[PDB]
Nucleic acid binder design. Structure first.
Lengths: 124, 34, 147, 49, 52, 225, 49, 187
RNA sequence: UGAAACCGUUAAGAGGUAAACGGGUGGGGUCCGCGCAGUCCGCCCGGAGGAUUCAACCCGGCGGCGGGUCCGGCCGUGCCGG
RNA sequence: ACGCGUCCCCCGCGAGCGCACGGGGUCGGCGGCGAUGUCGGCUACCCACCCGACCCGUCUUGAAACACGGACCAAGGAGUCUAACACGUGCGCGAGUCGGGGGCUACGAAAGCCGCCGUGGCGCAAUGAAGGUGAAGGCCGGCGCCGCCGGCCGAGGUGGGAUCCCGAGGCCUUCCAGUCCGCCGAGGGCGCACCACCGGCCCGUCUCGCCCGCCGCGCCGGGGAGGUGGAGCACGAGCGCACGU
RNA sequence: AGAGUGGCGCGGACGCUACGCCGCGACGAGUAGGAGGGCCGCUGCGGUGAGCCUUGAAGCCUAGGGCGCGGGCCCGGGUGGA
């Protein structure tokens, strides 16, 4: 299961970074970037991710297809959202809630798709 | 699940053929990092 | 490994686990088994009674192959065959009996331990102890000897 | 496949699986054939690492 | 000085053993000779068996 | 679904409250009935002595049931019989105290430790201030506080000691579940005496503090609690 | 040959049999006491008796 | 100061299983849960056994397990063994039992399953019956290991029957001055 | 590359109970804050504007799912035949 | 002590606002001082004063000692490999286990393979100086006693023993039956390991008594009752690898 | 907080490296000597860091600034030159 390979990874991966009494994780689709069992971004059968879009403008989102969990060049599926900051977040809350697609992440993907725009907006 | 899928076989150009192998059971035996 | 041992937790302490008062000094009792009837008496005579003295006759050029006697009990005397001499023998009407040879599985004398699985059996054996005779005969079987 | 990533390897684009190939890779003596071949199956990125 | 319960036992290191110690670091390319000069043998004796 | 079940969910709540208001009146009527005892027992000891003194008699008042004990010497250097007897009274440190019922087996323990303690026969004021201010419990192998009446009703209960009022009766009158309601208590936690000691080493009778005081233990309590 | 057959204990915990044979939870915390001296404080003293 | 000692009051039970193997540590996780949230006992005894060390949990054999269910009554009932289930040669006829151990040795699979009786492991006794109903809790013998025949009253004293540590037995190896009435004394 | 011991010279500091050390404060230096009018983050209301823009309806592509009863194919530490 | 419908000695869901000695603190309160001379900075450099403070290692009942080594600084400087043993702990396989010598065919002097390469080691059997011996029994029939004839069950108690199994009775929303699915339970059942006590079986030895078996009829072989010596039986836990003491 | 047969507005903080978090009590001297834990140091070998370095590596120096009870470690400046 997922629950197996955690026991394997937990304290060993090439994506693990420790020091100064802290501890982090640099895995593709970890949104909170921390070595955890909610938040790891490869293990499971379904995945959410929020990446900063191609050029400057926008945000890009990442679901994991339920099917072929053994076929990685056709496993993730992509879409870009380049609209107003309150209205862009209509989409993302309408992905997690109304699909029933893994209802833990809700309030992680609202605080990551609002500190990817507060960037590309011009500086103080 | 010992349950086995079907394994596709790629040509040396990259596109897949239409030939498959049933999974060698070794690939279901336990992971044991110790 | 030289890291998980005691001697790292002791760089810093003086006496290193062998004493302030009476130190680690070379050989305090005498080397090896000393004091066998003096000052290491008690011990010797309280975990090794009978070290000190003679008994019995001495045989000189002892060749041990002449003394050679392997052993096979009853309970598990059916352990020298396949699982085919017993299931078809239990099926019979006229009442047959398979021939377990014990010289073929490195066994010389046949011993008398547990039960028997009760169905006819002829038994070759170089040495029959007195219970291996009376257990096999009461059930029903011969006792042929071999040399 | 979540294990093979964590040994660093560069698999995000690999078609599939535990990968298999027709028996015509056993006889290649040229590296320019075997390099072109490594770029087809989408794993050159691991050599490039 | 025997502590307590614990088997009595006689060692033969009272001689100068170290001066006569034998090791087998050779063990791997001593085999690979025999097998070579083994492999010489029967090319010398062609259709005669190497089983002799 | 629900519209039925929500009204049935507004019938069980008023039941658990009614379990309190039938119990809330009983805490009052238990306390107003012990007040009747503490004028009917108080004035019935002044009743007999006048009506003896009347006919040229005498009246010896009732010899004690109950006695408080406080440990005044320290913890260093102590003889091995006394360490065992001070343990059994649960006085394990200096300036600590306990309730103790009286008999022959109970006094002759208190003659072996009679230069490590001070004891005496306490009153209706030196029973309650101690049990009100200081008094803790011993629930789940812990010294957890009594700011409630579902700790004493909840542990003991079956003996009929529910509220803070019955811990006054059963101790101040040594009644018929005393043992359990006094091994109920953790021993008390008095700070030092504010005024002081007379001379700690010696027996009261000589000058100092040690040994029994029959009616002036009331002076080393309102100074210490 | 496997010690345990389904390592998946994200899913074994929530199938019909295991969630019809366990008592209910206790998700409340009970923080520590400050003993208001009832010889001084009124309503603290009206609660005892 | 307060007169107490701090002498034995760190207790020495074992809180968690020293081994590393993962499939035993998802095992425990299950039963940690299953101990605390039920009102059945079995679970708690099983979790405490999932910690112990090889020697405190020794191989129960087929012919003991066979022998422990042919007593009067106990039927419709399984047999849990938090070590193993090994073969026994001196036993022939095999009924249709139900087993649930950690390692089932590779010949006692070919015996009980061929008689028409299934074997489980520790996540097939976790859904089949969560609390614990229809079981007999068996173990093997914790006084098998020779070691126990060097222990007790020390072999050189009245009335005692211990094996001492001897380099080898023969006809002379510890054979004289405290074993014979004739050579000083025997005990 | 160029450490310590030990010297020599500039600045400061101090100086009758050999010096040096621990607790606790005061004075003076050195630098350092980049200090010298003082914090952001939502929703709400009033008053000045920007940008072709929101609901809804049809047009293609993709997922999340069960169609409590559509059709096949593929597994099996599942069996019953030949 | 405060509606009413019936039982009596004795003459089961009302409506809202509000204040607080009530399961650990908050002002829906204020004021000065701010650019080349002032704000702050516990920490690290120098000075000053009050209280405290004898030099370290060390053997020793006792060291600041009129007990011994120490003028200062660098760089080196002391429980270690291998051969036995034993107890504990991890891991593979389990009445078994193990190829360690031998073989076959850059990293590799590695690594996969033999099975009719397990010879062999340790283990599954004790006990006697030896010749040697070598590990349950019951309960009904053919002739109140032998010597033999059939049929059935079987590794034997008592006492304490983690858990399971049977369930008298009950687990509420107007009442009167009726159930399925779960849980709570008076007392009453099979008794896993570990022990304490009682019986038995194999070797050695001691005292008493009568019959068996025979190609060789004995200075021949075998059975029976009660004491006693053991590192013994009595439904098995060992073997290879690694770590620590 | 049981289940039946009859009489307008599509919205609601944090969590759970389960080898983690959280929850309420009692205690805390130590020489010979035991034991655990060390995100305390020093040098080598397999893995890993799409690590870092002539736009300045190691070592040293530093009345510059920070970190932990502690062993020790992080950053400013100057040297130095792989």
């Amino acid at each position: 299961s997922a629950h197996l390979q955690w026991m394997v990874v937990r304290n060993c991966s090439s994506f693990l970074i420790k020091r100064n009494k802290q501890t982090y994780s640099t895995e593709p689709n970890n949104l909170k970037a921390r070595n955890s069992f909610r938040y790891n971004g490869l293990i499971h059968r379904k995945t959410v991710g929020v990446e900063p879009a191609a050029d400057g403008k926008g945000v890009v989102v990442v679901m994991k297809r339920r099917s072929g969990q053994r076929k990685p060049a056709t496993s993730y599926v992509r879409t870009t959202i380049n609209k107003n900051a309150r209205a862009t977040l209509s989409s993302i809350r309408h992905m997690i809630r109304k699909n029933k697609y893994h209802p833990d992440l809700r309030m992680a993907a609202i605080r990551r798709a609002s500190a990817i725009l507060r960037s590309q907006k011009p500086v103080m | 699940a010992c349950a086995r899928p079907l394994i596709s076989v790629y040509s040396e150009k990259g596109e897949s053929s239409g030939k498959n192998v049933t999974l060698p059971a070794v690939f279901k035996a336990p992971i044991r990092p110790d | 490994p030289s890291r998980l041992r005691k001697t790292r937790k002791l760089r810093g302490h003086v006496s290193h686990g062998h004493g302030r008062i009476g130190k680690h000094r070379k050989h305090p009792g005498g080397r090896g088994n000393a004091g066998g009837m003096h000052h290491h008496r008690i011990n010797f005579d309280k975990y090794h009674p009978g070290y000190f003295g003679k008994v019995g006759m001495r045989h000189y050029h002892l060749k041990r192959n002449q003394s050679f006697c392997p052993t096979v009990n009853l309970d598990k005397l059916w352990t020298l065959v396949s699982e085919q001499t017993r299931v078809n023998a239990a099926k019979n009407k006229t009442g047959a009996a398979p021939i377990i040879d014990v010289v073929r599985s490195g066994y010389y004398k046949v011993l008398g331990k547990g039960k028997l699985p009760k169905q006819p059996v002829i038994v070759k054996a170089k040495f029959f102890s007195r219970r291996a005779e009376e257990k096999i005969k009461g059930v029903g079987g011969a006792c042929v000897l071999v040399a | 496949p979540a294990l093979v990533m964590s040994k660093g390897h560069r698999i995000e684009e690999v078609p599939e699986l535990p990968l298999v190939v027709e028996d015509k890779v056993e006889g290649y003596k040229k590296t320019k054939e075997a390099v072109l071949l490594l770029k087809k199956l989408k794993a050159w990125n691991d050599i490039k690492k | 000085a025997p502590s307590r319960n614990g088997m009595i036992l006689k060692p033969h290191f009272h001689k100068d053993w170290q001066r006569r110690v034998a090791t087998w670091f050779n063990q791997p390319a001593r085999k690979i000779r025999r097998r070579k000069a083994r492999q010489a043998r029967a090319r010398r004796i062609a259709p005669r068996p190497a089983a002799g | 679904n629900f519209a039925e079940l929500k009204i049935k969910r507004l019938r069980k709540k008023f039941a658990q409250k009614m379990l309190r208001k039938a119990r809330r009146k009983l805490i009052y009527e238990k306390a107003k009935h012990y007040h009747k005892e503490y004028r009917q027992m108080y004035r019935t000891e002044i009743r007999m002595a006048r009506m003896a003194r009347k006919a040229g008699n005498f009246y010896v008042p009732a010899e004690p049931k109950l006695a408080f004990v406080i440990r005044i010497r320290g913890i260093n250097g102590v003889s091995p019989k006394v360490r065992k007897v001070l343990q059994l009274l649960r006085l394990r440190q200096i300036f600590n105290g306990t309730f103790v019922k009286l008999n022959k087996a109970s006094i002759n323990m208190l003659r072996i430790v009679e230069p490590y303690i001070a004891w005496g026969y306490p009153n209706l004021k030196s029973v309650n201030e101690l049990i009100y201010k200081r008094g803790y419990g011993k629930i789940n192998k812990k010294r957890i506080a009594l700011t409630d009446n579902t700790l004493i009703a909840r542990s003991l209960g079956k003996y009929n000691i529910i509220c803070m009022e019955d811990l006054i009766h059963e101790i101040y009158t040594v009644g018929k579940h005393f043992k359990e309601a006094n091994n109920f208590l953790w021993p008390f936690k008095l700070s030092s005496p504010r005024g002081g000691m007379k001379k700690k080493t010696t027996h009261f009778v000589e000058g100092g503090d040690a040994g029994n005081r029959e009616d002036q233990i009331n002076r080393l309590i309102r100074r210490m609690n | 040959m496997h010690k345990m057959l389904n390592t998946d204990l994200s899913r074994i915990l929530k199938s019909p049999e295991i969630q019809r044979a366990l008592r209910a939870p206790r998700k409340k915390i009970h923080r520590r006491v400050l003993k208001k001296n009832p010889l001084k404080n009124l309503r603290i003293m009206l609660k005892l008796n | 100061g307060v007169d107490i000692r701090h002498n034995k009051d760190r207790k020495v039970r074992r809180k968690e299983p020293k081994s590393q193997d993962i499939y035993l540590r998802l095992l425990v996780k299950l039963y940690r849960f299953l101990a605390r949230r039920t009102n059945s006992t079995f679970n708690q005894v099983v979790l405490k056994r999932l910690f112990m060390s090889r020697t405190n949990r020794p191989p129960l054999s087929l012919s003991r397990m066979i022998r422990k269910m042919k007593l009067p009554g106990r039927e419709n009932k399984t047999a849990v063994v938090v070590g193993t289930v090994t073969d026994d040669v001196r036993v022939q006829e095999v009924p249709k039992l139900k087993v649930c151990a950690l390692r089932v040795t590779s010949r006692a699979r070919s015996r009980i399953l061929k008689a028409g009786g299934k074997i489980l492991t520790f996540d097939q006794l976790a859904l089949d019956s969560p609390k614990g109903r229809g079981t007999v809790l068996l173990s093997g013998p914790r006084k098998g290991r020779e070691v126990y025949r060097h222990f007790g009253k020390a072999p050189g004293t009245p009335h005692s029957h211990t094996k001492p540590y001897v380099r080898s037995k023969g006809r002379k190896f510890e054979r004289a001055r405290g074993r014979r009435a004739s050579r000083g004394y025997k005990n």
